[PDB]
């Protein structure tokens, strides 16, 4: 079976058959894919739709298939990053823990295998303002993981800080706390110049004092 075949199958109106279609595609990926670039794009497009699904089995299966496409395409997946990242930001807001986790894992995989971490972050940073509080928390958690896996050298820290500053004021404690963890982890990697930066961000004084208390407690 071929790409023409899978392109048609993943676009079926009958969603009920997505798991069966997906399993076949997964086996196929594991085993031309790139003989028609248009068809490859339409297939990835459709699977990005599957990631959207409220059925966790389908969203997970879409994530697995996209992950397999990343394994086989590497930097040739770059053209799909924009739309995949939008879907991933939404998915990080999913009610189901495993789904949120697999969404985050794929985002990190893009930074490892498809394009430099900052290229991904230029798109991913849009998620900081998403109107799902779980998505907002997830973007912060991605930043922490990015530092844990790739370090701070690949990123332009000054473009990420202002987003965290907004999230210090979030309506949810879990989002504020994740943003705080993220800024403190930036501090761990970059050092005292992060304090210098944070004085120029318009942060209210009592909040800034609180952030610097967290910095003082960085290893205590």
Task: Report on this structure.
The chain starts with a helix and ends with a helix. By secondary structure, it is mainly α. The protein is elongated and about 60 Å long. It has helices at residues 3-9, 18-30, 37-52, 56-73, 81-91, 97-113, 117-124, 133-150, 157-167, 173-190, 193-198, 205-216. Helix 6 (97-113) crosses helix 8. The protein has one domain (1-220).
Short précis:
The chain is an all-alpha fold. The protein has helices at 3-9, 18-30, 37-52, 56-73, 81-91, 97-113, 117-124, 133-150, 157-167, 173-190, 193-198, 205-216. It has one domain (1-220).
Keywords summarizing the entry:
12 helices; 70% helix; 220 residues
Tally of DSSP helical segments: 12
Helicity level: over 70%
* Oligomeric grouping of the chains: monomer
Strand-residue proportion: under 5%
Largest sheet: none
Radius of gyration: 19 Å
Summed up, the domain count is 1
H-E string: HHHHHHHHHHHH
The total beta strand count reads 0
Which structural class fits the helix and strand makeup? Answer: mainly alpha
Distance between the termini: 59 Å
Overall shape: elongated
PDB class: structural protein
Keywords: Microtubules, TOG domain, Tubulin, Structural protein
Assembly: monomeric
Entry title: Crystal structure of Clasp2 TOG1 domain
């Amino acid at each position: 079976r071929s790409m023409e075949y899978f392109c048609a199958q993943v676009q079926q109106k009958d969603v009920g058959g997505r798991l069966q279609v997906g399993q076949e595609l997964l086996l196929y990926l594991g085993a031309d894919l790139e003989e028609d670039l248009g068809r490859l794009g339409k297939t990835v497009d459709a699977l990005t739709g599957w990631v959207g699904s409220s059925n966790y089995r389908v969203s997970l299966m879409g994530l697995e298939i996209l992950s397999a496409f990343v394994d086989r395409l590497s930097t040739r997946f770059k053209s799909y990053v924009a739309m995949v990242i939008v879907a991933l930001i939404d998915r990080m807001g999913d009610a189901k823990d495993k789904v949120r986790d697999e969404a985050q894992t794929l985002i990190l995989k893009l930074m490892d295998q498809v394009a430099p971490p900052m290229y991904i972050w230029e798109q991913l940073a849009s998620g900081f303002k998403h109107k799902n509080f779980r998505s907002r928390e997830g973007v912060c958690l991605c930043l922490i993981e990015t530092l844990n896996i790739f370090g701070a050298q690949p990123l332009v820290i000054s473009k990420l800080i202002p987003h965290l500053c907004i999230l210090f004021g979030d309506s949810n404690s879990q989002v504020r706390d994740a943003a705080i963890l993220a800024i403190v982890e930036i501090y761990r990697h970059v050092g005292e110049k992060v304090r210098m930066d944070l004085y120029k961000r318009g942060i209210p004084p009592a909040r800034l004092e609180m952030i610097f208390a967290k910095f003082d407690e960085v290893q205590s």
